[PDB]
Amino acid sequence: ITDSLAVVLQRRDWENPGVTQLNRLAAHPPFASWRNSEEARTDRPSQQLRSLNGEWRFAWFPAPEAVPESWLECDLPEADTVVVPSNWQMHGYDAPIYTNVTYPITVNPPFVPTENPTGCYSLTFNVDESWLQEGQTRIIFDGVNSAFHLWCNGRWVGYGQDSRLPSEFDLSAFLRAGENRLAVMVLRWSDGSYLEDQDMWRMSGIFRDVSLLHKPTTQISDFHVATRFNDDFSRAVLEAEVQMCGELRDYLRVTVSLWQGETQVASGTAPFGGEIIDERGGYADRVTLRLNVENPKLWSAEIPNLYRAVVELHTADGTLIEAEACDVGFREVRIENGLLLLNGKPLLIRGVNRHEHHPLHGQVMDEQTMVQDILLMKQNNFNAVRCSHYPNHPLWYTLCDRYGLYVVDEANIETHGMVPMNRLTDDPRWLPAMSERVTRMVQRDRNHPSVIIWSLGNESGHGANHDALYRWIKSVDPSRPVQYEGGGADTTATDIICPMYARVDEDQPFPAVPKWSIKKWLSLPGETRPLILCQYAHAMGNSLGGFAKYWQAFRQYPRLQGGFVWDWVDQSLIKYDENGNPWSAYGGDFGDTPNDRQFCMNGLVFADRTPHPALTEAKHQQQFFQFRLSGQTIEVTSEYLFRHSDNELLHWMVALDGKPLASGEVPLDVAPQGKQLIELPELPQPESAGQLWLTVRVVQPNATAWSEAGHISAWQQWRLAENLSVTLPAASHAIPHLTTSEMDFCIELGNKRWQFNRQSGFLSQMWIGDKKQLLTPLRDQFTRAPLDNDIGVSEATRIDPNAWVERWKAAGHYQAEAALLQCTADTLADAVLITTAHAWQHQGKTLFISRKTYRIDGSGQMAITVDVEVASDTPHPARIGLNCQLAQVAERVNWLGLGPQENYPDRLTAACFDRWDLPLSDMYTPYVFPSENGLRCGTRELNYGPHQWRGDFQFNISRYSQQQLMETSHRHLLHAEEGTWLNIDGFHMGIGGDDSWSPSVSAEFQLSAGRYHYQLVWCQK
Ligand SMILES: CC1(C)C(/C=C/c2ccc(O[C@@H]3O[C@H](CO)[C@H](O)[C@H](O)[C@H]3O)cc2)=[N+](CCCCCCCC(=O)O)c2ccccc21
Ligand SMILES: [Mg+2]
Ligand SMILES: [Mg+2]
């Protein structure tokens, strides 16, 4: 009759933001309904919390009206068997859509398309007869994207929205003895989708755990854990509020126990009945228990000391009815005099935004991937994670509790694609839907100590609903600051100025929502709050240029307390090719249109969690140990707030142009915020030529729960003495001969022979024996394969004239062909010298001039001098150097300069100067969107096979031309070219990365001088 699909779907509850659930139970902290209290303290499994994960029957429909009525009674024969949890896009049933701002549906709230992909999950399962005669049996859906109706045994149970928070329903009256059948109809789109416009893949399905929980009729319905402290934290009080449902009776009592290991630290017991709260009395169904704790071990990210609270509901005669439990971190979060304090000390947030993404399972996470992310974060000096932009899987907070990470729990509210952004969040008709997303988050995660900051959501402007919900959290949970960046990052709905992509020194004064410089932002009249960037340093491919500038500002300004880098993972997806070889897909690679292509990849680690090179630049800048050194005394400073360096030694080394001369390892016993001065022993000071470099590293001898033994926590380098080569070079035993063609200038000397084309003006090729050496003439280069930062949002459709790639193209940097002006040759006693002079023009105007002279002496060496002019009105070049295609292909590359990893001018602080030797594999960075990559800076010795270059240059080297990288869109479509492409540059523009839609390379890294000069020397070996 009434459990019909006809009647249920007729309500169209998914096109009505006033109905966000039906018959859904109240929210609460994680429950397990342990019937034994030692089971609760131990955090065992519980015989009352069954998992329904596993094999379900699934069938896909284009619209819920297409679902046959029989599906409520029987299984559909057309249905496949599917593992749950699952995003059905990852099973291939329809495409995942990657859109950023633009809604994947027609913006017509509260309505959704008639084409509403419907996933009809079903599951036949058994229930013990004990669950049917006593108690309450409920089903828990931890995550259903994006809304669903629930049937059990053909009868309709309820409805749910908000896809990142659990939905629980009472099944007691619906369950049969023996076999039962669930039928959950998941809708891809709902009115809740208008609040779920996060910049991510748009997936759907039952993508989190499903569970049965059995509880007694008399039950713990909710419990809150609070910890107040005294002046110096030597004494804490743990307040525990416990609420019950069921038959209230005079013999019912509640005990709350606090443990740490096998030690019961405290406990108290009381009957129900709270304090009088107003004229009608108090809450008879509640009670508050206060437990004193002398010298409590405090919870930090540095030391995640956890107690365990056990909540026993029992009778006076001692019959245990039910037990719940939670981990407890003794920690106080407050903002005082403008600073965010944790346990009275000012935090410095080494944060990152982290989406729930897995390249194969989509948005279906587990435990191994979560622990892998957490280990990788702490191993790269990260103390905080923002759950951008929704409540995470419950296990995530438990893990940050234990491994020690500060967490910003963010409500599942983003209306980015609305025009304006506060069209829904300022509408009071949407306040209920938004309140449910906020209140149910707090009701779920309020006992997790790792949660230090509540967030109202992301990119939804500033509306009155934000103010109402901000004030609701402050009233319900004073334990935590509330932050929200929408509407200009400093509205009345945030305790923290939390801008996204605000720059350090540069004002971006957009109307109504200016992104002021973070330094200036603090200074604004009447402004007193701390500033923690909700998002900063857009790590889209080759990026994080200018990252050190942020952390200089963080350390110099007290109220600049850090921020969360955007972001942790590439949201790459996995496709399969001709032969089933996997490759990384991004926007549009599933036929999804419209889409925002590579903007789904902003991580410091690839989707497989392999690191990008920018990761160690973050690790270096966010390291907890700062170093100064005067002469021989290293000043090392702890930026830890709670721990001594009781598992850290400093290894030190001093090396002249690579070769080590002195080792050493002295222990470190620096106090939190303290200092320690280490006198270095008599370091050797040789009269030898070259630069002497000191390198100190902080090494953890013992294994942590997040590192292995020997892990490096921090490092720093200084150039000590440098003695300049004063020696007159070793005399020659031969004079090279010059040969003047009508077309060529050719020089010869033993094995070596060089050939300059007098019509081109370039070194066309050189010889060693009967073995050719070049496949392309050694020519200039003023361009690079554009990085995602140079492209920005520029597409073939809508072009971004302000983007760097478009300023270059419009001036003809890529179409510029050389036009030779002078190319001589002269016989000198010591050598032969050809001087060239090329000009680059496009549509008339001469952009660049490059006067060179090459000097091949008895030397066996070839001295190239380059003196480049660049017009004062052409856009600054991305590069000023040379490139050529080597015939040689060698297995290893050795160089003297900053390494070992990729590094660029505005991203080289993590690199160290040394002699580095890697396979050619690692001199190319496999950015999924190919670009310029693998560059090493500060280099003046490069050894590849028989060749050797020296000067003071920057170089990248691999199998890929930079017009192949430019004309290719996916890494898996690149093929090794014949030979080896090498770009040698005396200068190279920075990569930028404060954001990836505006030019973000600061003036000091723009090739803007006008005249330029570098010197290379080519030689065999
Ligand atoms: C300023 C700029 C670069 C621009 C930039 C808009 C812009 C940039 C970024 C953005 O969202 C950002 O995208 C990131 C992707 O990794 C992250 O999600 C980040 O959290 C988020 O803030 C949202 C909008 N548009 C693209 C506009 C598309 C519609 C978006 C909303 C702006 C509007 O229409 O008012 C044009 C178009 C022509 C010239 C210049 C521009
Ligand atoms: Mg609805
Ligand atoms: Mg957005």
Ligand code: NA
């Ligand atoms: Na993005």
